[PDB]
Amino acid sequence: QAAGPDHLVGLGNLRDNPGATRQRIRVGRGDGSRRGNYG
RNA sequence: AGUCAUAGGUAGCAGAACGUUCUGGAACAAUUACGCUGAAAACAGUAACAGAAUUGAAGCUGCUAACAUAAGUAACACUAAAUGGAUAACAUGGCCGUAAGCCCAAGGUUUUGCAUAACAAACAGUGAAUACGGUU
Ligand SMILES: [Mg+2]
Ligand SMILES: [Mg+2]
Ligand SMILES: [Mg+2]
Ligand SMILES: [Mg+2]
Ligand SMILES: [Mg+2]
Ligand SMILES: [Mg+2]
Ligand SMILES: [Mg+2]
């Protein structure tokens, strides 16, 4: 029984501010990656 | 949504994303999937939002496992020698004979016996009685 307005806040709707968190750079992950061969 | 401008790249720097495993948000595969294609790529075709990582492998004379190549190749030449339709009991021939014979020791520890395939190791076998060796 799908229902529920879009303004209800729950643990599956949360998101941080844009620019607050970044992905870690995993070095050693291929030539196309950001720090691929020598780190 | 129409005009312009830019777009070779190693070292390096910056930005955006794909995928794997697990968790939170009640439960996103009980009864499967299978029109064979889509996308710029990583890929997709059984959620999505966040998070935690032992998170991505042709490339370390790396490690493990499997499978090829060389290749049906090399090898099956230290010796006495075999033959009769059998690794024969029989016959013929040959070889050792201070050994390739016989009796023990050390060591081995059942390697020892039985079936013209077989269903047999699951079964047997080592006897101190000559003042045998040891034990003293
Ligand atoms: Mg460029
Ligand atoms: Mg140019
Ligand atoms: Mg859950
Ligand atoms: Mg690792
Ligand atoms: Mg041959
Ligand atoms: Mg014969
Ligand atoms: Mg003995």
A17 sits within 7 Å of strand B by its CB: no
Tokens of A24: 């870690």
A8 sits within 7 Å of strand B by its CB: no
DSSP class per residue in A1-39: -----TT---TTT--PPTTT------SSS-TTSTT-S--
A5 sits within 7 Å of strand B by its CB: no
A22/B14 CA-to-C1' distance in Å: 13
Resolution (A): 3.0
* Tokens 């291929």 found at: A30
* Cα–Cα dist A13/A8, whole Å: 9
